[PDB]
Amino acid sequence: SNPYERGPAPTESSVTAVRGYFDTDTDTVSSLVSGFGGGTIYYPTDTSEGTFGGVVIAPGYTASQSSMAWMGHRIASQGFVVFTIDTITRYDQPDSRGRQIEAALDYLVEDSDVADRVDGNRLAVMGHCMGGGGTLAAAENRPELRAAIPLTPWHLQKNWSDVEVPTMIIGAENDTVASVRTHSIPFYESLDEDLERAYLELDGASHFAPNISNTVIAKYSISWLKRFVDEDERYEQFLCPPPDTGLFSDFSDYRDSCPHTT
């Protein structure tokens, strides 16, 4: 048996739902905290199935946690402790966001009021824009992390052959801020060929698609966290085989490393 499995067997409707199996509540973290700008922790109230994996979500350039807030209850209700952080300033660069993401991971595991609900050996990182660049930076610096999901990422550093964390990059086809040609795709193609990974390109989507309720982003983010943070093979079904990318699909592109071994 897998000791990290949480919640009932998934279905298409359960993984795409606005709220999962687990009721959640929130805890507010002050900006007084050292190393980042604080934020909000979304967590499951039910302790009976054990501790959960932890997830830090960073925002983009000029943005705050309010742009990522919808992912809080949505991911957390599937069985995760999700920490939507603010940065120190709204204009911090990607590598600074990386270090702030790292400090938030440590805060979550060591200092937070819900530390006893987090398994500190099973952590993940997500981020938008420059926060997605920071996601990669954090992943590169901490190979023990279980998953990384950069959302429409931006970073001048194009080479991430170093990264050993299973990463799902979600790009937006029509992104003009962090063009997929010059950001997302270079990042993905640089990833090691033996690294479990995925590139998801949303058809007709804008740079700010990750900042609004999106069933596609939610489904695949959830499925990726389940598969690697929880090593949950029950969610393999939503990642493999990969979705269609032809006419009338939500994906303009999809690149995979199926099957997923952990």
Residues engaged in binding Ca ion (CB under 5 A): 257
Distance between alpha carbon 134 and the CA centroid of its chain, in Å? 12
User: CB 79 → Ca ion: shortest distance, Å?
Assistant: 24
Residue with smaller CB distance to Ca ion, 161 or 262 = 262
Using a 10 angstrom Cβ sphere, with 0-12 exposed, 13-18 middle and 19 or more buried, the burial of residue 17 is: middle
User: CB 122 → Ca ion: shortest distance, Å?
Assistant: 20
Residue with smaller CB distance to Ca ion, 110 or 192 = 192
Residue with smaller CB distance to Ca ion, 214 or 257 = 257
Distance between CA atoms of 19 and 28, rounded to whole angstroms? 20
Q: Which residue stretches of 144-208 are H helix? A: 184-190
Encoding tokens for residue 74?
């949505």
Chain breaks in the chain (C to N over 2.5 A) after: none
Q: Which residue is nearest to Ca ion (CB)?
A: 257
Strands across the sheet containing 39-44: 24-29, 39-44, 81-85, 52-58, 118-128, 147-151, 167-172, 197-202, 251-255
User: CB 135 → Ca ion: shortest distance, Å?
Assistant: 21
Neighbours of 70 (CB within 10 A): 18
User: CB 16 → Ca ion: shortest distance, Å?
Assistant: 24
User: CB 262 → Ca ion: shortest distance, Å?
Assistant: 10
Residue with smaller CB distance to Ca ion, 253 or 256 = 256
Helix (H, G, I), strand (E, B) or coil at 42: strand
Torsion angles phi and psi, residue 65, rounded to 5? -60, -20
Residue with smaller CB distance to Ca ion, 11 or 262 = 262
Residue with smaller CB distance to Ca ion, 65 or 257 = 257
Cβ atoms of 107 and 27 closer than 8 Å: no
User: CB 258 → Ca ion: shortest distance, Å?
Assistant: 6
